[PDB]
Design a protein around this nucleic acid. Structure first.
Lengths: 98, 394, 82, 107, 93, 95, 86, 107, 93, 391
DNA sequence: ATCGGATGTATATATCTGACACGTGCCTGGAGACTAGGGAGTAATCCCCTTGGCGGTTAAAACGCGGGGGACAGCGCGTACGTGCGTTTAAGCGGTGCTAGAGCTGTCTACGACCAATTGAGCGGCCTCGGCACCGGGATTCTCGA
DNA sequence: TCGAGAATCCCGGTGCCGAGGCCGCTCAATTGGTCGTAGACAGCTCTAGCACCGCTTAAACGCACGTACGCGCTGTCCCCCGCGTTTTAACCGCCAAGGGGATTACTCCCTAGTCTCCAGGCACGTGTCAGATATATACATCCGAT
């Protein structure tokens, strides 16, 4: 019979992996385009220092990662192990973003 | 007990509608081939009319059954009906309403009515210095809509570009242009509608509040003024343009009044007014005026100074049961049925004379008034509309 | 040149990775769109202030400092870019 | 008369001279006391030394002789008082402390 | 053009604490930003302290009180020890 | 007798409508002085200082209960519990 | 010459009073464990604000904690307060 | 010879001159531009008017002619933008906005 | 010892927006605290802007940018509008 | 496969305990009436002694079965037994342990042992410039406690006020005083224990790490030094006090080493040392020394220069199978059973002479050594202890 | 769904108090007007790094198909919290009186700003090498159907 | 509980480039003066912080009671994980332009600093009207009964 891991096993393995490493988890180019796109609505024909785009991605991932930590506690608080949209919303509200 | 007002009783005296003056935009309701009338002329198409209301460039008419007919400029939807067909705005036609109306009112670009159930329907739009505003914050309303939804009302009054509403609880509500303080409920820095909230506060019927003051029992409005009567105290509160003492009281070194002030007006049967003059009808059936003398809109004759205190019109010796005003002219209907008029005749609104300004009240005797019973009179910008007593009275 | 729909760049596998680092074990499918929206807002806020600094300096190029000063202004100080 | 750095007089590695200037040109007050820069430079060196000492350990515990951002992170986040002093700060390439909620561990 | 830094001072301290340990460029940048951050915080608070008390001079006193306000628990205590230590020694030479 | 919860809602409305302080003033003042002992002995206070503290304190607690309340509702409950307060403060960064 | 030492004043923050606070916060039902948990939170909050307030007091070489001391303390902690000065 | 306040030249109520002094003696910069105080006083005056208007309305809505902290609190917490600007400010004796969670209501 | 405040200016503004409306002392205090706060935020940011760009003068430009950063949405747009008018009107008088 | 060290074997050669020197605090074990010996004297009460260890003011003795007897100054708990009854510290008595012991070690105020199962039990306390530190952060341990709970160890070594531990994995742990760098794992600012963590890092057994160095296979400790031998390369690493070259190597510009440094020591059979001198025994059974020459603790005759490079003791013609040291004295045991000593005799630790300093190795022949086969020699503060093979 | 009883809450009115608003005398902070220095505007330069094309390699995104396990509704039990009433505690208020210590003022000393001439610390630029990444392969560890 | 399978840890060798140490070279810190005022200090004024007596009563406490709520457990199913395969397009190395960041060189003009002058804004008195308070009452809402 074929070999399959149980649901959640690989998940935890991924958690341990990415919590140990420190590399950016978002794709460089796609993110750089998102930045430029969002920037269009503020000033026309903007140029970016390479480091400026990196500083944004660092701040963005650090922000999202931490947000997930809080989103996680909320799901767990409701006796669940699956994070849901309403979990993110509660976390942000408590923070003061909503 | 709790303060409560009764829904007004629709007029019951049957009559025939008359008009005179310029009808370039079809405000004479006499087809599209008649642009001027120097003498009062009949208006066919309206069955059993009981009440009239003149706007800036249009008119509303109420029937004994409660139906409303309109005609005139519909560039803003002031008529509240499909003006699609050719030359259909220059003839009186029916308006589609959720019921029958008790009262009607009209301004320069808008119209309003009080249905037989207490609902206030309005259509068209308002207009400040920056052009069109729309009826609601959304814009114009070609077709009638409920303005005070879920609120029982008992009275309505229209200015040039503002609407006044009275609830059965004695609460007053104003909506529309505010640049002259006709709303009576906004700060000088918000009347132009250029605040962070734009025009949302102008175009939403909001309550007019005079801190520590009894509920109001009656409301009136001129072109740029709003008048109220506080219950018990019977005091008349006024707000709006006052650059010519239209409010009948003084505003310390100000050209207008943003919030209501006490006037020394007593015994008021009805209040009418044009741009720069106000005609006052007292309960003893006498007529008094205030405003600027130019073009004899005050009906006092060779007056050279701005009349500041309510001055009773001398030449009017009979009892008056009704008064009316155009932008720059005035009307008076006697208890017996005669009709006087005065002011600017440059638009042939006086029904008498040949365009000459009448400095003193002159009786209007022509084919369609000679030996007839006059009931109502109200003027607009370049025209005037009247209601003569019919010989039916079903 | 004009940019459009680049928010789709932030993909399912990329979002779930961030979550994994956040300690998340199971993820609802609805989370992904919700995250993209949250991220857009975040970037809008920071980039807006960044550009405001950029325009004050009379520059056409957003520098790293513009982003850093912006993040600091919002209580999200960042080390390692000046 | 040969010159001695004010740093050396106070037995400091951080620049009392430079710090003193940054205060004057820093729009903080009209006047700066002689002891102010010495006291401030001293405090900066202390906090610098505190972080470095912890980062050093973190590097050794990973068989590394060169301190990288990841170590600075581990040092700060594992110290209650430093974590609080830098609770609103983000360290680039610092990563995150390993932390899995108990309810998520297999049962 | 000369752009000053705390690098050389951060490195000197590094050699006193871990003589056989080095530091990457990015780590040195982070350390450099951290020093400026703490500097601005402390100097800023000291600035207000002088203002609040209608003084026009930033002395050791304000710096010390600023440290007590900004640094948590033991950090503050030891930071004050070091601060006082240096000023005392400096008064000698 | 009013049903359980009915009077509670009435209290909610009453206090959201007013602005008076909800903690007894004197007991609070002693709490302040007691906590202050551990920093400087024989400390004196301006009345307005103690009052400024009570304003801040009650504003802080009221808001904390709002967040706490959201956590309770989140867990499909309508009764706030210590766990709810703990979650709120954790997300706030107070823990 | 009287040295008064205060003790157990945290109990002055009664259950009813805490309920009122929760009520203004929109809370409808309250667990009994809440009341003690709240006293702990309030204590930490006060310890943090008062500590800084006193730090300002000692700096000014004063024996009395002034309103401004509290105001400045609160501002430092991102809890600016209007209506007492500053 | 005949003097005239800088506020009047800018058509302002707030003190341009005082603001200018506060800026110079406030430890913000070596020098302060001529237009800075005018611009700042104008902005302060605008914000004051914005809040005082909403507050005034609040007092009127509660049948009062004198503004009190409560009216200020209502004015601010009901204005999305003003709320944000004062998201970390606490108004003494201001109370809170009436807000009961939907689920808490009976049916 | 005379202590100054924006009290009289706040009242002058109040009388323009609501001539028949007064204000309690506690409310006036809150208003005074608000002005001082906003002042410090704007001046502080303008201070940093001049610093970040290696300039030693706080001009109307730093004030404007500061406002754009500090004030939310329409508040900033109208604040900048008012600041512009004042400066314009002022330079012509 | 994976690096793994075997548990050490307990010594098997049965012998009799001998002592000499000052016994004020009962470090002679001859009772409380005997305060001094000038020649080696037999200690009564210990069955089947196989190993010995001399602290500063006390002694440890390991027996055939693995029991530990102790005697001396128990002011700090170094005897790991109840010393309430009078004179109970002036005579040897058993220590209560969960099991039997393989190795023993002693410092100035602490003791330690290695149980047959790989546990490291210790008692007493360490002492820095401020004073008592305690065995743990909690304070003194009048009775033995597992120090490396959970970890299996294969070797122990004690200095004056620090303990060195070796795990079966080749990892080295240190604990105690660190003001001389004997812990080899702390910065100058933390060796004093005056940081935000206080003495928490000094009193918690922490691994001594040398980045990118093989697992260590052997440890040694003098009064203020720690020595290690990393596998494969066989290099000897040293750390600690070095103001007199106790590390047999140079420390550029420093009076000591805070972290281990490479030494050119080769083929080490054993390392012993006092305070300012280190005695080195190689596998070819040749004895060498380093340190200051005062009082002839180097045994190189008339030398007035601080020996920096391991000089071999020429006066010793026989093969040496064991070396030992007191604070300022040295001992060598030949393969044929002889016993040589030298250094300060002012405390009658030399067991030969009349308190005079011996500038070179002098054979010790008294009523209790002549014709007998000596095995072990270890010195302490003001006393010395020996093991002589039995019949 | 309809209705009355019973309780709460909003509302009208009449009176009373004290805090707000306005008045005034005074002083000290801002407006005038003027000069001199140096920050900043402006022009023009050097060349950095931002941007954008080709084209190969392959990491990673996308897709789909089980099916295990967790979200969710239902529901049944009992504890615990709300409601209300009667007892009890001390908060609240006022009144009196003391004195600690906040606040102020005039001294006069000590310190910090300032400038000019000097020079060594600290910056930028340049190799050089060894720390570490990269890899491949074997030791060990953790998961999971019996 | 067992061994089979897949992942992670780890050990050693090879190669690459960034970190660390050197070397001119400024330019910022130092030294050593002088001058002026911020602030250290001492005395003095008097606010307000503190503390007890004692009356009133708001509010805390305590207890009994019933319900509606938290919570645990079972059943249903869809949805999210895991894995294998196909597909996209990120990633990277190379080449190359030129926008615009960073710089410099000059010179204007804007701002600090001053001394005189006087009116804006402060403290502080003084009177009245907004609102706190009380009460009688109409009105809105809850809840049990049917």
């Amino acid at each position: 019979k074929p070999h399959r891991y149980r649901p959640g096993t690989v998940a935890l393995r991924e958690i341990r992996r990415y919590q140990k490493s420190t590399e950016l988890l978002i794709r460089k180019l796609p993110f750089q385009r998102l930045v430029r796109e969002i920037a269009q609505d503020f000033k026309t024909d903007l140029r970016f220092q390479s480091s400026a785009v990196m500083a944004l991605q660092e701040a963005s991932e650090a922000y999202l990662v931490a947000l997930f930590e809080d989103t996680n506690l909320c799901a767990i608080h409701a006796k669940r192990v699956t994070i849901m949209p309403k979990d993110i919303q509660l976390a942000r509200r408590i923070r003061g973003e909503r | 007990i709790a303060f409560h007002l009764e829904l007004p009783k629709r007029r019951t005296v049957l009559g025939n509608v008359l008009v005179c003056g310029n009808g370039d935009v079809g405000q004479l309701g006499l087809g599209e081939d008649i642009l001027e009338r120097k003498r009062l002329s009949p208006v066919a198409g309206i069955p059993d009319a009981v009440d009239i209301s003149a706007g800036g460039m249009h008119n509303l008419v109420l029937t004994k059954s409660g139906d409303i007919y309109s005609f005139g400029c519909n560039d803003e939807g002031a008529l509240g009906r499909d003006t699609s067909e050719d030359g259909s705005e220059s003839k009186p036609d029916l308006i589609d309403l959720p019921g029958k109306a008790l009262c009607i009112s009209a301004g320069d670009s808008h119209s309003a009515c009080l249905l037989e159930d207490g609902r206030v329907f309005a259509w068209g739009s308002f207009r400040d210095s920056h052009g069109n505003m729309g009826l609601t914050i959304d814009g114009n309303k070609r077709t009638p809509i409920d303005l005070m939804e879920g609120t029982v009302c008992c009275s309505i009054a229209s200015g040039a570009d503002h609407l006044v509403i009275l609830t059965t609880a004695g609460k007053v509500f104003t909506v529309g242009c505010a640049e002259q303080g006709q709303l009576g409920r906004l700060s000088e820095r918000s009347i132009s509608g250029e605040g962070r909230r734009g025009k949302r506060d102008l175009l939403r019927p909001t309550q007019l509040i005079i801190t520590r003051a009894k509920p109001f029992e009656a409301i009136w409005a001129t072109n740029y003024c709003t008048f109220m009567r506080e219950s018990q105290t019977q005091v008349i509160w006024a707000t709006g343009l006052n650059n010519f003492k239209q409010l009948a009281h003084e505003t310390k070194g100000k050209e207008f009044a943003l919030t209501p002030i006490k006037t020394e007006l007593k015994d008021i049967r009805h209040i009418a007014g044009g741009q720069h003059h106000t005609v006052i009808l007292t309960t003893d059936l006498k007529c008094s005026v205030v405003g600027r003398p130019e073009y004899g809109r005050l009906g006092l004759g060779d007056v050279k100074d701005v009349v500041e205190k309510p001055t009773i019109v001398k030449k009017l010796t009979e009892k008056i049961v009704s008064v009316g005003c155009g932008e720059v002219c005035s009307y008076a209907v006697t208890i017996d049925g005669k009709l006087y008029s005065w002011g600017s005749g440059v638009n042939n609104q006086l029904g008498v004379g040949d365009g000459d300004d009448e400095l003193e009240p002159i009786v209007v005797v022509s084919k369609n008034t000679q030996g007839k019973h006059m009931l109502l009179a109200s003027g607009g910008g370049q025209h005037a509309i009247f209601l003569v007593k019919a010989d039916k009275q079903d | 040149k004009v940019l459009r729909d680049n928010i789709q760049g932030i993909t399912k596998p990329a979002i779930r990775r961030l979550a994994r680092r956040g300690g998340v074990k199971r993820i609802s499918g609805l989370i992904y769109e919700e995250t993209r929206g949250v991220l857009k807002v975040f970037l809008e806020n920071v980039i807006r202030d960044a550009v405001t600094y950029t325009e004050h300096a009379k520059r056409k190029t957003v520098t790293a400092m513009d982003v850093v000063y912006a993040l600091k202004r919002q209580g999200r100080t960042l080390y390692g870019f000046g | 008369a040969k010159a001695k750095t004010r740093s050396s007089r106070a037995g400091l590695q951080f620049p009392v001279g430079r710090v003193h200037r940054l205060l004057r040109k820093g729009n903080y007050a009209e006047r700066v006391g002689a002891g102010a820069p010495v006291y401030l430079a001293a405090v900066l060196e202390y906090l610098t030394a505190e972080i470095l000492e912890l980062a050093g350990n973190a590097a050794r515990d990973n068989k590394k002789t060169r301190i990288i951002p990841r170590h600075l992170q581990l040092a700060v986040r594992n110290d209650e008082e430093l974590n609080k002093l830098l609770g609103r700060v983000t360290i680039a390439q610092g990563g995150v402390l390993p932390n899995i909620q108990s309810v998520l561990l297999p049962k | 053009t000369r752009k000053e830094s705390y690098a050389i001072y951060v490195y000197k301290v590094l050699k006193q604490v871990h003589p056989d340990t080095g530091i990457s460029s990015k780590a040195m940048s982070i350390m450099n930003s951290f020093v400026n951050d703490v500097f601005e915080r402390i100097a800023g608070e000291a600035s207000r302290l002088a203002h609040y008390n209608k003084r026009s001079t930033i002395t050791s006193r304000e710096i010390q009180t600023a440290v007590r306000l900004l640094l948590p628990g033991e950090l503050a205590k030891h930071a004050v020890s070091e601060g006082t230590k240096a000023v005392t020694k400096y008064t000698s030479a």
